[PDB]
């Protein structure tokens, strides 16, 4: 029970560390998804994030939502942010103009 | 050709140390007494790597087509086009890469870069064979 | 005023992976052009394409004024 | 050490690499007869050491000179590149702004480094330095040849001002072409305090 | 923004944290990432096709409303890492 | 064992580029003094172990292959066994195995494809950046395969030349005649899969016209 | 080097062709700066304006005295290989005697 | 073909590697005759 | 060794890398005590040497050789005029940049804001933003800092060229 104590703080410490790691990665993806109507650090910081989470930084098989999220986010964030920005200023193309006369 | 790659112009990492086996088993030296189909260095450096250099040059010219009869920036002029300073950048880059000294330096790698020049004069000849002609 | 500022930054971020990322704006500009060019003596007709008589002096200064600011 | 034709020289190539191929043979010698086995060939190291050493230092000097005469030729087709000055006037009033012509600054370097290398051939014979002492080279040795090094370096700086003489006067007619030929007097004016 | 992001995890994770004790620290790795009461509802996120009325943006927000949900829950598991630091407090007591 | 005490191990300090002083291309390869060494070793123990019965760099070859390979009592099928296993499965085992070892060792195949370095940035980073790896990799491949087909010429001699003890020698002779036709095939495709990515060639799916 | 030469005689102008600014401040980086200050040598036009000190390390791989690919192969390979081998031989004789 | 010195163009050489981009053409190498030659080579390369 | 008793109790799923074992224990008490004692060999695997500092400190010292210096020299090395897959250490395992280069790291995103503002031809504010970045950079000048200044002067070139075309 001193080795259940030391074992408890041991695996509690390690699971605290990995919990801090996945907390960091999902925190970064929250920092990505938070950015609406900016579209500029979207590909910059988001593509910086995808270079770590699905990639080498969190490349254990650890979660499902980390794996499916960071594996998914190519087409979702890239295609959705992409065509979001494409139909952005088509709004302005409708707004440019009606002030012709 | 669909440039997946044959290998590349990236044999400069590989093809140094993989000539040691072409010279320590000296291809093919030992290889004791039979009919063994010796060289094999070249035979791909004859066939494969040379045609891969030729078509690799050709696709490299297709990374400077840019679809403009013309447009450019040109501190002194119009200079028509990005095509022009493209083929300047290409032939300057490759003609620093593929040969500097030694003039052959080449089986026909000289004649390869000569063929890149010949294609460039074919295309910018074709612009005048289209706009004027 | 900022009439291409969105098109500017749009073309920047989309031009990280140019250029089909901004090629459909050719289509949207051709379409909403073809609405704004239209019509008033119908005037999406300039693609080898009555309504002639739906035009007079106020419609004239209207028409070539509005097309003039379109060219601007 | 050249090695090839052009550039052990202008092209600081024996100026860098010649210290390496110098220094290993120096340690190999100093050890190789620091074992005192036995006698009267430690003389032969005392001959061969200073032979290759002084011949080498002469070689770097010769490269540096015939190099540095070609320096300002095909170099300063430039503009007021490097800096500035702070030379006070006759009324001691802030009158510089004397600038720049970077061929000043390059030849301010390529002799200082050669001073560092020849410092590492004159003062080479300190750090070896073991028993017997079979000290086969003197740490502050050749006062005759030290005076000769003073002579060759003086000839080097004289070759510098000759190089601005030829490059200024006729090579060919453009410091740019009067177009600040005052550039050339600006460079010389910096050279009076460089 | 409390342990209501991990409500049944006060049993479904914390009892498996209290007397579990973590069994077997791959479940604390992966099944606490499959995340009893938090990301055991991990289905249909999904950035919903079809066309952007239905929905493609709310389910895209719910593609990472585990960044809301399982990270105020994993953050609540980081708040339970403070309870694991409380387990490291008493694990600093009996040690 | 005594085949290229490694270049580019490591770095003669400082003297770092040219590629190093070791290579390039001062690692001659002339005909190689390296190949005078190795092709002196196998000619030494081959015709001098043969001449003997008509660490010495590398005594394990003729030593272990001798006292191993002569102490077989029904050897003649087992020669075909080591042949027919080792050709395909060994050649693809090594040539797979090294590229696997780098392919997860410090990969990071980041510099994923070219990082779009145009176009004709053709192995640009050597210059000692990230083609310091692949030179050591493909160098270690052609080195290991060299000592391999060396040694298969050394058993294709060692007892087959000359009937120690079996005058049915043409087994391992076939395992040079199609031993070397094995390995020269297995390198040749490893030529064609040096495609311009650091292609890493570890998938194996073969799909027909229907997915 | 050079057959059918520049003729004559094939200098690189290497104290420009390298040392316009080069190893001129990289081989001279254990060489420069040693009190080699700037005095507004922020090169105020365009490019060579880093120049603070120690390090802001560029810190050039320094191809050679620049255009010497093969001549740095010559000085390097010849002089360093031969003298390296003789260092090994004198080591073995140092043990022997 | 004349390189010659540049710097031009873009990454201040942007190619600069350059082992004939891939060769030495390292014949065996083993062939030091060198012929005292020639033009370099008109060879119809001048005609090219 | 997966815990696949859900498809079949008294059966095991040991899929070692490029393999798969259906090594079916006959009783399930040997299966439950087998994956249970392999979960106690995850109290030996997952507790003894899973990582616990191993991938942690291996990621520390191994990540600590990042772009080019660990391992200083150097006589075949430089990283002056490039980005060359630029290791964004702020977004990497440092996240905790020094508030000089942290607050200028967001002004490195302010440098990218200058790239937006240049990219819409609005020079003025981006120029003065760059003046602020020169001010804080200038004053509070710990190693990557210099490379940040390289990007800064790169973009000062971009401005000077761009205005001199635009005028």
Curated annotation (Swiss-Prot), chain C:
It comes from the Eukaryota. The chain holds residues 305 to 405 of 910 of the full protein. Present with 4280 molecules/cell in log phase SD medium. It comes from Saccharomyces cerevisiae (strain ATCC 204508 / S288c) (Baker's yeast). This is Exocyst complex component SEC15. It is found in: Cytoplasm; Cell membrane. Component of the exocyst complex involved in the docking of exocytic vesicles with fusion sites on the plasma membrane. Belongs to the SEC15 family. The exocyst complex is composed of SEC3, SEC5, SEC6, SEC8, SEC10, SEC15, EXO70 and EXO84. Interacts with SEC4.
UniProtKB/Swiss-Prot annotation, chain D:
It comes from the Eukaryota. Present with 3400 molecules/cell in log phase SD medium. Component of the exocyst complex involved in the docking of exocytic vesicles with fusion sites on the plasma membrane. The exocyst complex is composed of SEC3, SEC5, SEC6, SEC8, SEC10, SEC15, EXO70 and EXO84. Belongs to the SEC5 family. This is Exocyst complex component SEC5. It comes from Saccharomyces cerevisiae (strain ATCC 204508 / S288c) (Baker's yeast). The lineage of its organism: Eukaryota, Fungi, Dikarya, Ascomycota, Saccharomycotina.
From Swiss-Prot, chain E:
Residues 72-95 form a coiled coil. Disulfide bonds: none annotated. It comes from the Eukaryota. The exocyst complex is composed of SEC3, SEC5, SEC6, SEC8, SEC10, SEC15, EXO70 and EXO84. Component of the exocyst complex involved in the docking of exocytic vesicles with fusion sites on the plasma membrane. Belongs to the SEC10 family. Present with 2340 molecules/cell in log phase SD medium. This is Exocyst complex component SEC10. The gene is SEC10.
Swiss-Prot record, chain I:
The modification Phosphoserine is found at residue 80. It is found in: Cytoplasmic vesicle, Secretory vesicle; Bud; Bud neck. Residues 65-95 are annotated as: Disordered. Residues 65-74 have a biased composition (Polar residues). It comes from the Eukaryota. Residues 102-149 form a coiled coil. Belongs to the EXO84 family. Involved in the secretory pathway as part of the exocyst complex which tethers secretory vesicles to the sites of exocytosis. Plays a role in both the assembly of the exocyst and the polarization of this complex to specific sites of the plasma membrane for exocytosis and to the budding site. Also involved in assembly of the spliceosome. Component of the exocyst complex composed of SEC3, SEC5, SEC6, SEC8, SEC10, SEC15, EXO70 and EXO84. Also interacts with SNP1. This is Exocyst complex component EXO84. It comes from Saccharomyces cerevisiae (strain ATCC 204508 / S288c). The lineage of its organism: Eukaryota, Fungi, Dikarya, Ascomycota, Saccharomycotina. The gene is EXO84.
């Amino acid at each position: 029970v001193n080795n259940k104590k030391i074992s408890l703080k041991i695996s509690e410490a390690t699971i605290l560390i990995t919990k801090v790691v996945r907390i960091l990665e999902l925190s970064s993806k929250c920092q990505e998804l938070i950015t609406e109507r900016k579209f500029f650090k979207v590909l910059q910081n988001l593509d910086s994030l995808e270079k770590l989470y699905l990639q080498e930084f969190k490349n254990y098989n650890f979660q499902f939502l980390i794996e499916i999220y960071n594996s998914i986010p190519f087409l979702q964030k890239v295609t959705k942010d992409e065509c979001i920005n494409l139909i952005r200023n088509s709004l302005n193309l409708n707004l440019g103009k009606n002030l012709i006369k | 050709v669909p440039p997946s790659v044959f290998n590349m112009k990236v044999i400069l990492d590989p093809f140094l140390l993989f000539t040691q086996s072409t010279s320590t088993i000296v291809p093919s030296v030992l290889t004791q007494n039979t009919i063994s189909s010796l060289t094999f260095f070249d035979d791909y450096m004859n066939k494969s790597f040379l045609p891969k250099i030729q078509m690799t040059m050709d696709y490299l010219f297709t990374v400077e087509v840019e679809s403009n009869n013309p447009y450019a920036l040109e501190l002194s002029d119009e200079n028509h086009n990005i095509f022009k300073t493209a083929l300047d950048f290409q032939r300057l880059f490759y003609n620093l890469l593929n040969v500097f000294n030694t003039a052959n330096t080449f089986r026909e790698k000289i004649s390869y870069c000569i063929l890149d020049l010949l294609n460039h004069f074919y295309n910018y000849y074709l612009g005048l064979f289209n706009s004027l002609i | 005023e900022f009439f291409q500022l969105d098109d500017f930054h749009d073309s920047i971020m989309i031009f990280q992976n140019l250029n089909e990322l901004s090629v459909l704006s050719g289509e949207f500009n051709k379409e909403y052009e073809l609405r704004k060019t239209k019509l008033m003596y119908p005037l999406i007709w300039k693609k080898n394409k009555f309504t002639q008589s739906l035009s007079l002096h106020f419609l004239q200064d209207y028409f070539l004024k509005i097309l003039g600011f379109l060219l601007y | 050490d050249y090695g090839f034709i052009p550039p052990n020289c202008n092209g600081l190539s024996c100026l860098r690499y010649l210290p390496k191929i110098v220094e290993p043979i120096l340690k190999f010698s100093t050890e190789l007869a620091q074992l005192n086995i036995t006698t009267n060939g430690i003389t032969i190291c005392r001959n061969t050491l200073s032979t290759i050493i002084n011949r080498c230092v002469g070689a770097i000097s010769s490269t540096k000179l015939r190099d540095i005469s070609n320096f300002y030729q095909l170099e300063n087709w430039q503009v007021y590149e490097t800096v500035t000055f702070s030379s006070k006037s006759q009324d001691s009033s802030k009158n510089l702004t004397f600038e720049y012509g970077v061929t000043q600054f390059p030849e301010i370097v390529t002799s200082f480094q050669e001073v560092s290398i020849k410092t590492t051939r004159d003062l080479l014979f300190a750090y070896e330095k073991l028993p017997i002492i079979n000290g086969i080279s003197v740490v502050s040795y050749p006062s005759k040849q030290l005076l000769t090094g003073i002579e060759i370096q003086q000839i080097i700086s004289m070759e510098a001002v000759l190089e601005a003489i030829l490059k200024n006067a006729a090579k060919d007619k453009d410091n740019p072409r009067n177009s600040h030929t005052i550039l050339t007097l600006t460079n010389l004016q910096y050279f009076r305090e460089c | 923004s409390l342990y209501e992001l991990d409500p049944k995890w006060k049993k479904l994770l914390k009892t498996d944290n209290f007397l579990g004790g973590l069994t077997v620290n791959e479940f604390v790795q992966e099944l606490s990432k499959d995340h009893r009461n938090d990301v055991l509802i991990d289905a249909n996120t999904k950035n919903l096709p079809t066309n952007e009325k239905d929905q493609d943006a709310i389910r895209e927000a719910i593609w990472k409303q585990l960044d809301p949900k399982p990270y105020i829950r994993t953050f609540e598991s980081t708040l339970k890492e403070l309870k694991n630091l409380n387990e490291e407090t008493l694990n600093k007591r009996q040690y | 064992v005594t085949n290229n005490d490694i270049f580019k191990i490591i770095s003669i300090s400082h003297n770092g580029f040219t590629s190093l002083e070791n290579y390039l291309y001062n690692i001659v390869n002339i005909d190689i003094m390296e190949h005078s060494k190795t092709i002196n070793k196998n000619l030494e123990q081959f015709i001098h172990d043969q001449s003997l019965n008509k660490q010495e760099n590398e005594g394990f070859n003729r030593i272990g292959f001798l006292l191993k390979t002569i102490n077989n009592i029904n050897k003649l099928p087992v020669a075909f066994n080591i042949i027919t296993e080792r050709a395909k499965e060994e050649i693809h085992n090594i040539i797979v195995k090294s590229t696997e070892s780098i392919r997860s060792k410090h990969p990071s195949l980041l510099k994923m494809a070219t990082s779009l370095k145009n176009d004709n940035h053709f192995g640009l980073p050597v210059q000692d950046i990230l083609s310091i790896i692949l030179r050591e990799c493909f160098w270690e491949i052609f080195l290991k395969l060299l000592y391999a087909i060396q040694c298969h010429r050394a058993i294709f001699e060692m007892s087959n030349i000359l009937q120690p003890t079996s005058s049915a020698k043409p087994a391992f002779k076939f395992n040079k005649i199609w031993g070397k036709l094995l390995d020269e095939i297995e390198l040749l495709l490893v030529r064609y899969i040096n495609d311009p990515e650091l292609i890493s060639s570890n998938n194996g799916s073969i799909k027909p016209i229907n997915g | 080097n050079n057959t059918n030469q520049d003729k004559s005689q094939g200098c690189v102008e290497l104290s420009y062709y390298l040392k316009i600014n080069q190893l001129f401040q990289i081989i001279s980086d254990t060489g420069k700066d040693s009190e080699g200050l700037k005095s507004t040598v922020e090169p105020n036009k365009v490019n060579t304006i880093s120049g603070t000190s120690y390090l802001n390390l560029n810190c050039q791989p320094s191809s050679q005295g620049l255009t010497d690919s093969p001549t740095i192969i010559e000085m390097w390979l010849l002089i360093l290989k031969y003298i390296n081998d003789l260092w090994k031989i004198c080591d073995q004789f140092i043990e022997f005697w | 073909s004349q390189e010659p010195m540049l710097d031009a163009d873009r990454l201040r050489s942007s190619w600069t590697f350059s082992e004939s981009m891939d060769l030495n053409y390292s014949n065996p190498s083993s062939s030091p005759n060198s012929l005292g030659n020639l033009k370099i080579l008109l060879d119809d390369k001048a005609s090219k | 060794v997966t815990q696949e008793e859900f498809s079949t109790k008294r059966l095991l799923f040991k899929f070692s890398n490029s393999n798969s074992s259906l090594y079916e224990c006959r009783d399930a008490d040997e299966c439950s005590r087998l994956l249970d004692v392999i979960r106690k060999a995850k109290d030996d695997l997952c507790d003894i040497f899973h990582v616990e500092e191993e991938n942690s400190k291996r990621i520390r010292e191994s990540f600590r050789y990042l772009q080019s210096t660990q391992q200083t020299p150097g006589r075949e090395n430089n990283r002056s005029p490039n980005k060359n897959k630029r290791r964004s250490m702020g977004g990497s395992i440092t996240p905790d940049m020094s508030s000089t280069a942290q607050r200028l790291k967001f002004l490195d995103e302010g440098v990218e804001e200058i790239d937006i503002e240049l990219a819409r031809l609005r020079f003025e504010s981006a120029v003065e933003t760059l003046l602020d970045i020169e001010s804080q950079l200038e004053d509070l000048s710990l190693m990557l800092l210099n490379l940040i200044s390289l990007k800064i002067e790169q973009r000062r070139e971009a401005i000077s060229s761009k205005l001199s075309q635009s005028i």
